[PDB]
Amino acid sequence: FSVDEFSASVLTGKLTTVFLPIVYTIVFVVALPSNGMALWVFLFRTKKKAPAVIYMANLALADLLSVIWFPLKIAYHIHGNNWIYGEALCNVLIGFFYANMYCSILFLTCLSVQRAWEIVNPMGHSRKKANIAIGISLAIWLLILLVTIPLYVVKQTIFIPALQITTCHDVLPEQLLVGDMFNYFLSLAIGVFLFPAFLTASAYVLMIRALADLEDNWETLNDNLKVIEKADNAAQVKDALTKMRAAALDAQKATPPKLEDKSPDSPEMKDFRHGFDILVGQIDDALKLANEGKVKEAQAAAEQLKTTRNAYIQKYLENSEKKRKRAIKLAVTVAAMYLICFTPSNLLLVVHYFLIKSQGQSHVYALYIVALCLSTLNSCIDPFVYYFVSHDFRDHAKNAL
Amino acid sequence: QIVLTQSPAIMSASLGERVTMTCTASSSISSSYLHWYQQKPGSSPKLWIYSTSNLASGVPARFSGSGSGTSYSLTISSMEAEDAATYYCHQFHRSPYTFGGGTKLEIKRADAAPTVSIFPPSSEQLTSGGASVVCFLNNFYPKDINVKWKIDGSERQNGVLNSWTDQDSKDSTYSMSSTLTLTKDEYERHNSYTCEATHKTSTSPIVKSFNRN
Amino acid sequence: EVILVESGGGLVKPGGSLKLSCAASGFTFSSYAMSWVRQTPEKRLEWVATISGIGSYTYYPDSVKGRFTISRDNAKNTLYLQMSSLRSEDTAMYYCSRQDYYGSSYDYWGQGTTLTVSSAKTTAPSVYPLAPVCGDTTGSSVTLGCLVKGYFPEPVTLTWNSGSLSSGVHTFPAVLQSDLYTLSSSVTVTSSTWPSQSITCNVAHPASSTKVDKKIEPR
């Protein structure tokens, strides 16, 4: 019938009627074609069909299924927060809003863990692992469809006589359900926010370090090689070759960056390991001379090791440092998405309903609105995610501009 | 239109007691809509506990309201002298925004006997016109009291005027005043004027009567 | 910090029109919603009208609607409440209140304004000295009474010996009966106090402007 003064000022203020439709318009122009093309690439241009592509396809799908409703969302705010399209259509927008909110987090957790898991403990069932990833996506989609039930089924529109407007979502029509609303958004903020954030952050912890460990093995290989050429005694040559061998065997076990989604049984992957077999064999040739007593002769074999390193190794292990940089930028991209889109929203969602439950009004109402607005930016940050993960997306991204 | 009932409407409590007062509603109201107000005689009813639990500025820590849905209550940990005021519960859930009955809080003291003193109509009043028989009852506990006007044994209901006072600030005792309105022509026709006063102090009411001349 | 004062009221003829002014200070009037709440003689509070801070957004309950018109003035910082076709049920203490939020309700209240909707003529008060009966003065404490009958409208300033004494003084409130208020007051004094010195009663009426002082005599 009549809301609190603080809410009524916000619902008539420029923050909702000017700032919001502008930001939302930007998101519409930016996010719709970007995710539109990304979804197209993952379906009709990606011939790898790896579990990472599948997660990113649903991520783009979650983005699209929300941004398409933005023209009605923009029009709503421009006309002073007044909904004239019906209660059912309001609950649609509300549904797909919270759906993309939570699908994004869950699909980010899947993608981040999956990509980190292919580095720590890689497997070789690209076809089976894909089918699994599809099933997981269906499971996620249905679990969210079920969890967003108390948002679809409840009256989300109210006519405010003093404001002469019909608000959608922004005003709770039944102030008696605040108790239920509080617990609900507190459950999600823990189980669908913090818990996936914990799994997301630690995934990059293991991913980055391992990509710095591949850098360590390449570094140790180049460091010990320089020691042999400068060494004088037999003990300095014998130990440096044993250390260079251990680093070479560990680097062979790891997956190269040029051939990412290429299975460990593929002929391209065999070429990378072939260069290592010539390299390891040459360390064995040097050790044989070192064990017999020939120091200056061990030393001459290291010069042959530089020839194999510049022809086969500095072609595949050539761009492993570029792969490390992509993972970092990805970790930055994700962190910004959490810092801007996820954390301000979930935190305030609890805060907002907590105050309405305790006092009947919340002074964080303006922050709650700004938070919900900035949360939609995730679909604008999502294309940067596809750029650092998908190799096929980069081609279509670069060719377009 | 939600009906708010305050149980009890009047209650006596001694200093240092765990004072509790309920506010019942017809339909279900949100915990975010029930607010409490304290009102001292003469002064305006000021905000005390907003949205069943949260306390207003300058409100002592001894107050801690609890309750949600249909059941709502104001709780005082330590009863004080300044707490003696009327308490109202307000709802803003559905128009009309109804107010509670009012729980009149009073200080519980030792039960006192009323000092009944009768007064005959003034000579200045009798000569001018009418004749009012005034009877005063001062310092008694509790507020529960009943006076009876009798003219020569016969019970009189006509002309009986009753006035009551609130609890005192100095000794917390109650007072009552009863007046019997009669005319110059009917006052002369009678001789004795009886006045009975029933109280919880004794089974036999305190009677103060006078004889004409 | 925040203080509100009500102006108007008084004796109004039933079926007329009156205006009530509510002065505001310490805050931004436009930034907060305002409301009027009445209190019946039986000390029972009732909602009258609430106006939104943005603009002219009025709402009254079924019983109030169609008569009362809550007027708002942001530039003058004074709240109004105009009435039409007044009834005897309107006889209540009208309080002004600032509604901050729906969940915060009326955080700041006014003081109140007395409204006595009656057609009853301005009647002068009659003071009568009441004293103990013949030869009965043989008591430790002697009680003395006074009666103010047949006066309209209320209130009356009653003080024993120009407010020199208050110990054992019980001033009873007036009860409306047959359009004439009736007041009584009892004073308990020592045996040596009366009839030693004159124990007179000072009664004053503001509306009719009548000041009467009656000497209490044993005969």
Residue with tokens 């019906």: A86
What one-character-per-residue DSSP string does A168-221 give?
ESSS-S-GGGHHHHHHHHHHHHIIIIIHHHHHHHHHHHHHHHHHHHHHHHHHHH
Burial of C115 (0-12, 13-18, 19+ CB in 10 A): buried
Reduced 3-state DSSP string for A327-350: HHHHHHHHHHHHHHHHHHHHHHHH
CB contact under 8 A, B54 and A356: no
Q: Are C80 and C72 in contact (CB under 8 A)?
A: yes
For B197, what's the count of Cα atoms within 13 Å in the CB-facing half-sphere? 22
Experimental resolution (Å): 4.0
Query: Could you tell me the CA-to-CA distances from C66 to C53, C58, C59, C116, C208 in Å, in that order?
Result: 22, 11, 10, 21, 34
* Amino acid found at C82: Q
C129 — phi, psi (to 5°)? -80, 125
- Assess C53–B contact: CB distance below 8 Å, yes or no: no
CB contact under 8 A, B30 and A359: no
Domain shared by B72 and B47, yes or no: yes
- Assess B27–A contact: CB distance below 8 Å, yes or no: no
- Assess A3–C contact: CB distance below 8 Å, yes or no: yes
CB contact under 8 A, A359 and B54: yes
CB contact under 8 A, A5 and C59: no
CB contact under 8 A, A360 and B51: yes
Query: Could you tell me the CA-to-CA distances from B94 to A1, A131, B90, B97 in Å, in that order?
Result: 8, 55, 11, 6
Q: Give the domain CATH number at B97.
A: 2.60.40.10
How far is residue C212's CA from residue A54's CA, in Å, rounded to a whole number? 99
Residue A300, helix vs strand vs coil: coil
What one-character-per-residue DSSP string does C62-86 give?
TTTTTT-EEE--TTTTEEEEEEES-
Full domain range(s) for residue B59: 1-109
Which residues in chain C are contacts of B121 at CB distance < 8 A? 128
Domain shared by B65 and B143, yes or no: no
B11 — phi, psi (to 5°)? -145, 140
- Assess B71–A contact: CB distance below 8 Å, yes or no: no
How far is residue A268's CA from residue B111's CA, in Å, rounded to a whole number? 104
For residue A151, the distance in angstroms to the closest alpha carbon of chain C comes to 23
Which residues in chain C are contacts of A360 at CB distance < 8 A? 101-104
What is the third-level CATH fold of A205-312?
Answer: Four Helix Bundle (Hemerythrin (Met), subunit A) (1.20.120)
Q: Are B80 and B38 in contact (CB under 8 A)?
A: no
With vertex at residue A63, the alpha carbon angle to CA A186 and CA A201, rounded to the nearest 5 degrees, is 55
CB contact under 8 A, C177 and B138: no
Strand pairing class (C169-177; C180-190): antiparallel
With vertex at residue A168, the alpha carbon angle to CA A167 and CA A171, rounded to the nearest 5 degrees, is 65
Q: Report the candidate in A63, A57, A80 with the shortest Cα–Cα distance to residue A9.
A: A80
Instruction: Provide the chain C residues 129-188 that lie in CB contact (below 8 A) with chain B.
Output: 129-134, 143, 145, 147, 149, 168, 170-175, 177, 182-184, 186, 188
Q: Which long-range contacts (C-beta less than 8 Å, at least 24 apart) are formed by A221-227?
A: A221/A247, A221/A248, A221/A251, A221/A309, A225/A302, A225/A305, A225/A306, A225/A309
For residue A5, the distance in angstroms to the closest alpha carbon of chain C comes to 6
Count of the separate structural domains present in chain B: 2
Helix or strand (DSSP H, E) at A74:
helix A70-78
Identity of the residue in B56, B122, B175 whose CB atom sits nearest the CB atom of C107: B56
With vertex at residue A370, the alpha carbon angle to CA A365 and CA A374, rounded to the nearest 5 degrees, is 145
Instruction: Provide the chain B residues 23-52 that lie in CB contact (below 8 A) with chain C.
Output: 32-33, 35, 37, 39, 43-47, 50-51
CB environment B28-53: b (16+ within 10 A), e (fewer): ebbbbbbbbbbbeeeebbbbbbbbbb
Is the bond preceding residue C153 a cis peptide, omega within 30 degrees? yes
CATH architecture assigned to C121-219:
Sandwich (2.60)
- Assess C133–A contact: CB distance below 8 Å, yes or no: no
Domain shared by B114 and B178, yes or no: yes
Experimental technique: X-ray
Domain shared by B32 and B68, yes or no: yes
CB contact under 8 A, B32 and A178: yes
List chain C domain ranges.
1-120, 121-219
Identity of the residue in A175, A179, A358 whose CB atom sits nearest the CB atom of B33: A175
- Assess A359–C contact: CB distance below 8 Å, yes or no: yes
Domain shared by B199 and B147, yes or no: yes
Residue A117, helix vs strand vs coil: helix
Question: Within 10 Å of residue A363's Cβ, how many Cβ atoms?
Answer: 14
Which residues in chain C are contacts of A3 at CB distance < 8 A? 102
Tokens matching residue A80: 């002073």
Which residues in chain C are contacts of B213 at CB distance < 8 A? 134
- Assess C52–A contact: CB distance below 8 Å, yes or no: yes
CB contact under 8 A, C104 and A360: yes
Q: Are A359 and C104 in contact (CB under 8 A)?
A: yes
C191 — phi, psi (to 5°)? -60, -40
* Amino acid found at A394: R
Which residues in chain A are contacts of B50 at CB distance < 8 A? 359-360
- Assess B50–A contact: CB distance below 8 Å, yes or no: yes
Q: Are C68 and C100 in contact (CB under 8 A)?
A: no
Domain shared by B181 and B90, yes or no: no
Interface with chain B: mutation pick from C45, C156, C213, highest number of B CBs within 10 Å = C45
Identity of the residue in B53, B92, B93 whose CB atom sits nearest the CB atom of A358: B53
Rounded-to-10 torsion of CA A194, A198, A199, A204: 130
**Which residues, 6+ apart, have CB-to-CB distance to C179 below 8 Å?**
C118, C120, C152
Domain shared by B203 and B144, yes or no: yes
Which residues in chain B are contacts of A359 at CB distance < 8 A? 32, 50-51, 54
Question: What's the gap between Cα A7 and its chain centre?
Answer: 35
Tokens matching residue A64: 């699209």
CB contact under 8 A, A5 and C101: yes
Residue C2, helix vs strand vs coil: coil
Residue of chain B minimizing CA distance to C110? B44
Domain shared by B118 and B36, yes or no: no
**Which residues, 6+ apart, have CB-to-CB distance to A113 below 8 Å?**
A199, A200, A203
CB contact under 8 A, C43 and B125: no
- Assess B31–A contact: CB distance below 8 Å, yes or no: yes
Tokens matching residue B186: 């009917």
Rounded-to-10 torsion of CA A253, A258, A264, A270: -90
Strand pairing class (C78-84; A165-168): unpaired
Q: Report the candidate in A179, A211, A144 with the shortest Cα–Cα distance to residue A354.
A: A179
- Assess C108–A contact: CB distance below 8 Å, yes or no: no
How far is residue A52's CA from residue A111's CA, in Å, rounded to a whole number? 6
CB contact under 8 A, A3 and C102: yes
Residue B64, helix vs strand vs coil: coil
Residue with tokens 């679990």: A143
Burial of A48 (0-12, 13-18, 19+ CB in 10 A): middle
For C7, what's the count of Cα atoms within 13 Å in the CB-facing half-sphere? 9
How far is residue A90's CA from residue A222's CA, in Å, rounded to a whole number? 62
How far is residue B35's CA from residue B92's CA, in Å, rounded to a whole number? 9
Domain shared by B125 and B142, yes or no: yes
Question: Within 10 Å of residue A97's Cβ, how many Cβ atoms?
Answer: 20
A338 — phi, psi (to 5°)? -75, -40
**Which residues, 6+ apart, have CB-to-CB distance to A18 below 8 Å?**
none
CB contact under 8 A, C103 and A361: yes
Domain shared by B18 and B44, yes or no: yes
CB contact under 8 A, A178 and B33: no
Which residues in chain C are contacts of B99 at CB distance < 8 A? 37, 44-47
Q: Of B85, B109, B133, at which residue does a domain stop? A: B109
Length of chain C: 219
Residue with tokens 């909707």: C117
**Which residues, 6+ apart, have CB-to-CB distance to A44 below 8 Å?**
none
DSSP 8-state symbol, C156: -
Instruction: Provide the chain B residues 172-201 that lie in CB contact (below 8 A) with chain A.
Output: none
